[PDB]
Write a protein that binds this ligand. Structure first.
Ligand SMILES: *Cc1cc(-c2c[nH]c3ncc(-c4cncc(C(=O)N(C)C)c4)cc23)ccc1B(O)O
Length: 263
C-alpha cells in the first residue's frame, strides 16, 4: 500500500484538528488531518480517504499519504496557502480578484466536477468553504466527503442526517437522495457565493421556510454585477427536476467559452 507511511515522516507546525506540517523526506509543506479516538464517525472518514486514492485532477485536493495502522490517524494532503475560498473572496482586493478572475475560478471548479461526473462520484458538500485557494487564484475542490456510485444513479444518506440547508437540492432535503444532479444544484449556490464575494445564501430567510419557498419556485435574485448568461446558468442549476439541470460537462464547456471570451 504505497499510500501508507509512518507518522515520524511528518513534523507538525501549526494547527489550523487539521495541521500545517512538513513532509521531511521532500521538504514539502503539507496538510495533516488527525483523528484522536476510534469512533465509527472516524472510520467512515478513513474509508473516504481510500476513495481519494483513485482521484487525480489538477483542481482537486491531492492525497499524499495516510497513517491507518494505529491512532492517532493521519490523512496527508497537499497544502493550499490561501485557505478556503469563502474567506478568500470576502477579504480580497476586488480590483485584483475581478470578474475575469471569478470566471476563472468557476471554470476550475466545473472542470473538477466534470471529472467526478465521468468517474461517477458525488461530492455531497459543494460550497465555497470547501474550496481551497492556492497561488495565482488557483482553486481546488476539497474532496474529502466523496462517495462512489457503486450501483445506479442515487446515493441515499442515513435517515436523520443533517445537511447544509441552503446548499442542498430539494430532492436531498425531502428524501435524503443525492446524485450528480444534486451536486449541480449545490454548484449553482457556489456560483452565487462566488458572484457575491462570499455573501450568505438566501440572506435573512428562515431555514425552516427554505424548502417551501423552493417548492413555490422562489430562487435567489441575480447578484449585482453578475452577467446575465451566468445567472441563466445559475437558474438552470436550480431547476426543480434533477433531469432538467445541466451536466457538469455542459457547464464546463459554457465556462470555458465565457472565460476565453474575456480578452
Ligand atoms: C480534511 C480537511 C482538509 C483541509 C485542508 C487540506 N489542505 C489544506 N490546505 C490548506 C488549508 C488551510 C490553510 N490555511 C487556512 C485555512 C482556513 O481556511 N482557516 C484556518 C479558516 C485552511 C486547509 C487544508 C481542511 C479541512 C479539512 B476537514 O474536513 O476538517
Amino acid at each position: 500500500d504505497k499510500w501508507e507511511m509512518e507518522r515520524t515522516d511528518i513534523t507538525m507546525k501549526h494547527k489550523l484538528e487539521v495541521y500545517e506540517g512538513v513532509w521531511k523526506k521532500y521538504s514539502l509543506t503539507v496538510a495533516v488531518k488527525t483523528l484522536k479516538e476510534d469512533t465509527m464517525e472516524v472510520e467512515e472518514f478513513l474509508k473516504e480517504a481510500a476513495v481519494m486514492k483513485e482521484i487525480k485532477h489538477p483542481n482537486l485536493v491531492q492525497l499524499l499519504g495516510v497513517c491507518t495502522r494505529e491512532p492517532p490517524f493521519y490523512i496527508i494532503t497537499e497544502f493550499m496557502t490561501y485557505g478556503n475560498l469563502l474567506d478568500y473572496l470576502r477579504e480580497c482586493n476586488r480590483q485584483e480578484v475581478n470578474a475575469v478572475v471569478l470566471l476563472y475560478m468557476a471554470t476550475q471548479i466545473s472542470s473538477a466536477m466534470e471529472y467526478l461526473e465521468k468517474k461517477n462520484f458525488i461530492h455531497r458538500d459543494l460550497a465555497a468553504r470547501n474550496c481551497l485557494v492556492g497561488e495565482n487564484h488557483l482553486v481546488k475542490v476539497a474532496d474529502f466527503g466523496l462517495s462512489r456510485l457503486m450501483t445506479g444513479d442515487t446515493y441515499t444518506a442515513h435517515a436523520g442526517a443533517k445537511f447544509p440547508i441552503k446548499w442542498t437540492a430539494p430532492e436531498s432535503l425531502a428524501y435524503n437522495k443525492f446524485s450528480i444532479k444534486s451536486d449541480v444544484w449545490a454548484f449553482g449556490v457556489l456560483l452565487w457565493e462566488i458572484a457575491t464575494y462570499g455573501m450568505s445564501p438566501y440572506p435573512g430567510i428562515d431555514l425552516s421556510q427554505v424548502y417551501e419557498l423552493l417548492e413555490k419556485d422562489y430562487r435567489m435574485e441575480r447578484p449585482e454585477g453578475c452577467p446575465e448568461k451566468v445567472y441563466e446558468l445559475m437558474r438552470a442549476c436550480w431547476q426543480w427536476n434533477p433531469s432538467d439541470r445541466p451536466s457538469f460537462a455542459e457547464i464546463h464547456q459554457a465556462f470555458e467559452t465565457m472565460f476565453q471570451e474575456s480578452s
